[PDB]
Amino acid sequence: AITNREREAVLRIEFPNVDVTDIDFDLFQARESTDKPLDVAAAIAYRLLLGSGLPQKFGCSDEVLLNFILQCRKKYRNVPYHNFYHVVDVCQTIYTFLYRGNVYEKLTELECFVLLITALVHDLDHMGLNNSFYLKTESPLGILSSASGNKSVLEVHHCNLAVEILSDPESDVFGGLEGAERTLAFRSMIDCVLATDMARHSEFLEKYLELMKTSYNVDDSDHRQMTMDVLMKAGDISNVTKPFDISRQWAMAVTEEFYRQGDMEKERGVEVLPMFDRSKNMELAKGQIGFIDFVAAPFFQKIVDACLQGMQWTVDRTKSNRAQWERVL
Ligand SMILES: COc1ccc(C2=NN(C3CCCCCC3)C(=O)[C@@H]3CC=CC[C@H]23)cc1OCCN1CCNC1=O
Numbered sequence: 001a002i003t004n005r006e007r008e009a010v011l012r013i014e015f016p017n018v019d020v021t022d023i024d025f026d027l028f029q030a031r032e033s034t035d036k037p038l039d040v041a042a043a044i045a046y047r048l049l050l051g052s053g054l055p056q057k058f059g060c061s062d063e064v065l066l067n068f069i070l071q072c073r074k075k076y077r078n079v080p081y082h083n084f085y086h087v088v089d090v091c092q093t094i095y096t097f098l099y100r101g102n103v104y105e106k107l108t109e110l111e112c113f114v115l116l117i118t119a120l121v122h123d124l125d126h127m128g129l130n131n132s133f134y135l136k137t138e139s140p141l142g143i144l145s146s147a148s149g150n151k152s153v154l155e156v157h158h159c160n161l162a163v164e165i166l167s168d169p170e171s172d173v174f175g176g177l178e179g180a181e182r183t184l185a186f187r188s189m190i191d192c193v194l195a196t197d198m199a200r201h202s203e204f205l206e207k208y209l210e211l212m213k214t215s216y217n218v219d220d221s222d223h224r225q226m227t228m229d230v231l232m233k234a235g236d237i238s239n240v241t242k243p244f245d246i247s248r249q250w251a252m253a254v255t256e257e258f259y260r261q262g263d264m265e266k267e268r269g270v271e272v273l274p275m276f277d278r279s280k281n282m283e284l285a286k287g288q289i290g291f292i293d294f295v296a297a298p299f300f301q302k303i304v305d306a307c308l309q310g311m312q313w314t315v316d317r318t319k320s321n322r323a324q325w326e327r328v329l
């Protein structure tokens, strides 16, 4: 259970002059303009969610929401990219897709609450190593994945820890729900987290696009779940949709993390993909262009054109940053 001093250090932070709901919100500046960035990161998620009125509508008390955010924070490690700031960023970004991009019309209010909560658990206990690393090294989590027949090594791990956090009534943000609602909350959270495995990127993307070939049915379960998976995925790959100074800082962080994995693979005598090679060097600009061309740009263009017209800015900023990385060359 959380200490009173730990809760007070977060509770006391407010943002009257910095709008945490804006598409231009700068998390790097929020971290850099305080001596307690992990407390400010937790307060951003706390104030964003209480500010929405969503937890209150689903019987999640302020204290339970805070206990939950701090329990999540405790399970994030000191790695360059997959740290607590990434999930706070994903939470904030998804909030913009829902309420600035109008995707809230495509989901129920409960599903919006579930998605924002899911953003905070989606990478619990990441060590800055991808799924492939655990399998190539025969690490315990890889062995567990292989034996249990689940190829999403880390995503299943993230689900286990999410369920553990929520098993404590004092951090159960779904504790105010009952019956079908409570079942939907756990089921949707788990499916959203499992949808973040990038080995399944094209699978989830094309499954969504095909269900959207026939008129979107907001009355349908599969339709809303696929929208939730697509929005979780969109937040995960949203660093390319931000202002350049921000998008560049995310690129630096992911590069440093990837390079540390590559150094660990070199030390262990396992295969190193060029993207993870520290000593060998690739231009940051080349890496981001590749990521945009083969992953981010087709994903956002396709989801915007099929249904998410309000998220058109994601397509525009991706091109703006892509053209900026071309100039950096
Ligand atoms: C800010 O830039 C990036 C942010 C996140 C990612 C992710 N990639 N993937 C894979 C990596 C393999 C190749 C394509 C498929 C995506 C993941 O599974 C990560 C975890 C989940 C979601 C996306 C994350 C990648 C980025 O730049 C890549 C370009 N590179 C890599 C090194 N530098 C650089 O610019």
Ligand SMILES: [Mg+2]
Residues within 6 Å of the ligand: 122, 123, 154, 196
């Ligand atoms: Mg992940």
Ligand SMILES: [Zn+2]
Residues within 6 Å of the ligand: 086, 090, 122, 123, 196, 236
């Ligand atoms: Zn993530």
